[model samples]
Target chain A: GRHSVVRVEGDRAIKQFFPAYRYNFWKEAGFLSLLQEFDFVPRLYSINPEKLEIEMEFIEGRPIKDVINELNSETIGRILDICRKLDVLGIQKEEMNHPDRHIIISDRIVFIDFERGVIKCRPSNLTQFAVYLNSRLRLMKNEELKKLLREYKKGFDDESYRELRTQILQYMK
Target chain B: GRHSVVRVEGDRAIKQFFPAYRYNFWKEAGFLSLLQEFDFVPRLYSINPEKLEIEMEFIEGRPIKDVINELNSETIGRILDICRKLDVLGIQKEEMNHPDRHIIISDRIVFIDFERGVIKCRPSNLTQFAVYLNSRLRLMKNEELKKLLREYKKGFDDESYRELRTQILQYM
Candidate 1:
């Protein structure tokens, strides 16, 4: 079922040099690196370009879509905090041709396989990714996300979130 | 292709949530906690059972593998030294199953997906995981790995490392 390239250390390390057009997509996104920064993702290890070898920690779980299809608006709003954080940080992951895929294995919202990621700010991004919620998840409003972002900002020692939110609020008028 | 989940201010964060099994797996694995100790991986937040959500800083760079792939055993040895250090310090990847499945981006290896994790260790873990490797890879020999472990130790410091590897080599 899975392709095997070369197993290392007497097969203890399995190498899958698949003919992937691109790889390490997240390295540029710095999103996966965030895994270690916030203690949100798996542990990272060293990478070997010479061998096209990546010796990372593995997960014995599948994608989150298998468990829950659509989440509550509040939950989605909380998760969206990541999107906003990406925007705030200018780390691209949303794109027209390239979109950020989600994997919710237990109760987390993770970004997987970032071969194609582009950070966007403006009209086109909304159209491509449909940043606005429709009927089912409409309740997941900006207010909730503001709270999530507000809390998230603590790590940055940032109360500027409130100031930024207020500025955006005033600008809407 | 993705449907929007919410609107906050002018920007809209997408809708999403990780799976339950993944949460359980990560909770057990302690992926976020392990990442905090490394220079490469992302640092985690919100690892509590009630939250089950992880928040962290997102980095930007090309995967190290993109820059170089064919690695010298010396480089691999030094990098492996890092992994061994983290493991001994009790601060390493929570979901690492394979001894050599590291992913590289921007001269760095990015570890993603924190499922299949645990905070505690089993005394027989060395035997179990090593055996599992033998079964899966089949080419590896515990004896050989043991020899390599010794070789690695000879030139190693971090007395704890020398001690642990010694014990591991001695018994398991």
Candidate 2:
């Protein structure tokens, strides 16, 4: 959504940001570099801060927006798992409620665009994804999902997260 | 030379330095990061300063010591070019004279082990390689190569380096 351009050359994707929006480049690069051990995010190759550019592994995949209607339960579960991981890591993947272009499905499911991700804040990746999931799948009725989200938001522990995950998966089944 | 152990897993090599020699890890990682645009060095992937470890692209090739005898003029020239580039960038590779394990001969020549690399000093990568070349190829007779090296050391300019390069290539 920011002023940036991405070009794919061979197996690398170069993302160059405009001068005014250069900070976004560092934000995304920082998260990618810190999360190199994780497979759900793209691998960062190199960063050119002067050029406001970042070169990373290009995932050959389609955005989830294009395949949302055809996604299987397994794929949906995988997406939930990624959201849970991000929540645990204290990273808010900013626009998950309308993650049209943020999620890419390829050989693996990748979550991209961490420019708006926040740290040390109350992360809402799982809670936000729950809203998105209910809108599409109609998994919960009325305020049932709202109550679960509030419980997880209040506790932010393994037990709360597990309960939320189990309740959501039950609705999917 | 420091207490660092390297293990190659798949396409990546993990170099873990001992606790005492952690500074060497930074020295090597710094040079690799600064020289990422150059093709003569390996690509750095991730560095864990706390763990005193560096993860980089693994080069699959023999060391220069193993192939020194069979090296052709073209390969030698490529190595010379790399040395010149490092010199121009003011990086002292520290072991060009005994670069048995420093230079790797793969599809492309790659220089490794920059833990002793120094910056902004009187770099001698080109001069050090000259000494190694003279010992192996006998590129010049007597003090001829020595005089040219002295001239390049004094001037540290394009003309002096060009003269030195030309004189050495003539005997190759």
Candidate 3:
């Protein structure tokens, strides 16, 4: 009854799609390959189009929500870097809203579950994720930072994104 | 029927008991008075034995379980100090076993509810609390600390409790 099922075999995670729209396996496999260049996701070993499955790395980590109270500037900075990278690619993984579930922090910060990810979604990953984070961390927005992000919401570019990054760093400090 | 009921008005917490056990108000009140020296507990404003009620300071804090992952040495030390205070008083708050519910961490670590606290309990608060903390924090006990705490379980005294504090400081 589910769209996809996942199982852990030894050290690998095997994600298999159900029947009807079996082609989703390729898109998922393609996304995993696309994300491999980035450090925030698990390593993709192989994809089997015939079996409708993909083998990837299994990470042992706790969710970001559990560590929110203890998070420091450096940790949040790492997550911001990953978010900016996805925004640059226009890949919007809508699950960034409840980052507690989607983001895992172990040896490193990793973003998981890309089933709903799409390219070029308006209110894209950067804006949506930033809004959600600002809501969750009430301390994140001040008059100055709010004004800065308001400018970012209107139009995003290399200059504005860098300013947004600086504003978040200011909150962390 | 319930033994007591509580209500919060402004910064005050009002706890009222059933008609029969009016004296329980004093026990709770006295315990609050006894614990006035400790910073981990809420402040007791006044007690009305005639009305079978007590007014106290309300604490807005999360349970210990919520912040267990982020706890550091200084925080754990505060909890240990509370445990030792209860042990010295020979007052065992049996709820220390499930301290995740009973203990709160806001600006500071605070222990709430003293209804079950009593004098001269064999296990005592320090030992009971240590055992509970040991169970919840599976990663807390390494080989050396395990052996050190094992010595603690066999018997407890001021010196041994101090040693336990030293051992925990070593771990953190």
Candidate 4:
């Protein structure tokens, strides 16, 4: 409804972008196509630039906003893992701070609405999602979390990432 | 063998890039990832930049060079269609003029070696392939095919494309 009219038919979803927001169609299709091998996003079935439409696999599940109260540690861990993957890909899926409607909790979690996604030299996907998690769960003090996030931003290597992950999970416990 | 050492394991092919050609790993991986929705390229299974390796679907088929003599009209048509698809994507799959080893004719035709592919405002994928076709088949006069190719390079719209196709096939 934002820039595209999405209609779900059986197992597929057809998203047709409005004329003014036609570029969003290409952005969404390109990201979906690039991330097709990953399971965290929907599968791209087909793309039609003439009609400004993208047909993709329909994800039938409740938005993360609706299930925030009922989410378990496993669900939260999966979300963090997906954020890490996106960051590794250099994809900044904007609105991660308020991704209430962006993530759907099906049998597995799926991220949607990549119209605002962009390839960045340094993406804040993991840090931004951590901010949201801290806001909702009050996992760590602001200063403490900021220190860990700063270290991660300096070098997004395996060691820094693991340290951040451990700190976040420590606070969750 | 050019930039990567490729090894096939069962149904997967692992390509490990040499230190000097590490950039080719990203180029090939990015193009394959971008074109995953299309069937002309192999499916990318996983990418490891640290190791400079890419795991992809193993394509077992003869290179187009090996089958050029045995190619029928249907196979040639499919190659032209693939070239059109690459043109529409704005991908200049360099070496189309000598794509003898770039194209693999499996159950379906699959394009390989995209490390040299680049996004361009105006790509010559179709026209270059037509040149290759003309050289082999000698379907049309040089000046006539050049005229059609020039028209296609001008707009690349449906009409120009169809006319070019008609002219090429008319000679085939």
TM-scores of the models, in the order given: 0.31, 0.51, 0.44, 0.53
* Tens digits of lDDT, candidate 2, B1-172: 5669999999998999899885576667656765666788887777676787878889889999888878877788788888888877656778799898889998799988887765533579988898888887776765887788889999987887778777777776
Tens digit of per-residue lDDT, candidate 4, span B1-55: 4788888888998999998976576567657766765788986666665677878
Q: Chain B alone: TM-score in each candidate? A: 0.46, 0.93, 0.80, 0.92
Q: In candidate 4, which residue ranges exceed 4 Å CA deviation?
A: B1-172
User: Per TM-score, what order, best first?
Assistant: 4, 2, 3, 1
Query: What is the C-alpha lDDT profile of model 4 across A76-116, one tens digit per residue?
Result: 87888898888877678888988988899988899999877
Better of 2 and 4 by DockQ: 4
Query: What is candidate 2's lDDT per residue for A1-173, written digit by digit as tens?
Result: 46699999999989998898755665676566545557898876666766878788888799988988788877888888888887776567688998888899987999888876655335799889888888887887859989989998899877888888888878774
- Those runs of model 1 whose alpha carbons end farther than 4 Å from true positions after fitting are A1-31, A59-64, A67-70, A95-101, A118-173, B1-172
User: At residue A67, what lDDT does model 3 achieve?
Assistant: 78
Q: Return the DockQ of model 1.
A: 0.02
Candidate 4 residue pairs in clash (backbone atoms < 3 Å): none
DockQ of all models, two decimals each: 0.02, 0.02, 0.00, 0.04
lDDT by residue for model 1 (A58-172), tens: 4334443443335444444444454445445433554422232243344655544433343222113222222233222233465654554444344332355444333333322
lDDT of 4 at A18: 94
Worst 10 residues of 3 chain B by lDDT: B115-124
In terms of TM-score, how similar is model 1 to the real structure?
0.31
Error of 4 at A173 (Å): 5.8
Candidate 4, overall lDDT?
Answer: 0.80
Order of candidate numbers by lDDT, starting with the best: 4, 2, 3, 1
